[PDB]
Design a protein around this nucleic acid. Structure first.
Ligand code: D3T
Ligand code: NA
Ligand code: NA
Ligand code: NA
Ligand code: NA
Length: 326
DNA sequence: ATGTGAG
DNA sequence: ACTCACAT
């Protein structure tokens, strides 16, 4: 969050390459944690060996910083930005279902764009094919006026099915965001607690129903606990049609509701801060259970929770309500 | 079982 | 950080 942006920019882009184009995940981590250290740094960096004093920045990662701070930018990130392969892997990556490995494989075979893909759906698995089919609007985001409209359609249909069901919309929404990427529903039913076995049925029935009233149109994956698929708000009579959205429905044990609604309402970075900044206090927060991390690596028997706050006050952390979670 | 993808 | 689902 400091006036060291440029430095951490090129650092982040340099990893988004080792991820997408190179083999390396460890190079991807090293470059990212380096971005992290420099971001929190109080001062403005004017040397390469000054950033090096930090843990995570080291010889080759600090040589490059000298370049950035000596001559404009970096040569490596120019050969990359001006490569056909790299740019195309990065493009393909943008369909859900495709990431690094498959893009590599596709670009190796001269497949590089939407038109390229549509003529080549044979190569894609089912997930990817729906990501394709709905590429345009999957990158579009969702207004609230329209977001609520779906909530009043999931809350209303899930209750008509069986009034014991509880649906709480999470992610961005709970954080108050004016715009969301994709719909996130945590589902809870009394019949299902942590001690009880499975009940895929409890999920699959609100799914199968949401399909019947034609609000869910596709499925990416559907299991015991989790459904990932595609929704779309009702075409208010012909043509002016709303775009297709992504939607998750997770089925949470009723007794571990609080832990679960914590895990959702992100961000994913807030979940990684809070989780890491717990393992110093020797705890292992889940989406299910907070629990002491004993002597060796043995994770002790859970921990009572009747509110998020309790998780918060377990790990000796200030409380931050859903809207300050990032 | 593992790798991959999404979360 | 830590899980879940898919496809070998
Ligand atoms: C990706 C990811 C997510 N989570 C949790 C935390 C949030 C929920 C849903 O997050 P989402 O990606 O939709 O974020 P959302 O807030 O909905 O952002 P958009 O509005 O979709 O952009 O998942 C996580 O723990 N680790 C992860 O790596
Ligand atoms: Na993708
Ligand atoms: Na979301
Ligand atoms: Na999601
Ligand atoms: Na943790």
């Amino acid at each position: 969050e400091t006036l060291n942006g440029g430095i951490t920019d090129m650092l982040v882009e340099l990893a988004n390459f080792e991820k997408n184009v190179s083999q390396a995940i460890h190079k991807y981590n090293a470059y990212r944690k380096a971005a992290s250290v420099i971001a929190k740094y109080p001062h403005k960096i004017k040397s390469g060996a000054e950033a090096k004093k930090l843990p995570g920045v080291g010889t080759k990662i600090a040589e490059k910083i000298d370049e950035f701070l000596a001559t404009g930018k970096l040569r490596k990130l120019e050969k990359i930005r001006q490569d056909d392969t790299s740019s195309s892997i990065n493009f393909l990556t943008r369909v859900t279902g495709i990431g690094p490995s498959a893009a590599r494989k596709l670009v190796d075979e001269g497949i590089k764009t939407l038109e390229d893909l549509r003529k080549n759906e044979d190569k894609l698995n089912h997930h990817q094919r729906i990501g394709l089919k709905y590429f345009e609007d999957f990158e579009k985001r969702i207004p609230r006026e329209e977001m609520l409209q779906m909530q009043d359609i999931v809350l209303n249909e899930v209750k008509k099915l069986d009034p014991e069901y509880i649906a709480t919309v999470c992610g961005s929404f709970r954080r108050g965001a004016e715009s969301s990427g994709d719909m996130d529903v945590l589902l809870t039913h009394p019949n299902f607690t942590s001690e009880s076995s499975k009940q895929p049925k409890l999920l699959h029935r609100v799914v199968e129903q949401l399909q019947k009233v034609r609000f869910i149109t596709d499925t990416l994956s559907k299991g015991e606990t989790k459904f990932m698929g595609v929704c779309q708000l009702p075409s208010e009579n012909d043509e002016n049609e709303y775009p297709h959205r992504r939607i998750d429905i997770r089925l949470q044990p009723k007794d571990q509701y609080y832990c679960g609604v914590l895990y959702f309402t992100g961000s994913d970075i807030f979940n990684k801060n809070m989780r890491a900044h717990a393992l110093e206090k020797g705890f292992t927060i889940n989406e299910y259970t907070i629990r002491p991390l004993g002597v060796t690596g043995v994770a002790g028997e859970p921990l009572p929770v009747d509110s998020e706050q309790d998780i918060f006050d377990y790990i000796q952390w200030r409380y931050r309500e859903p809207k300050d979670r990032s």
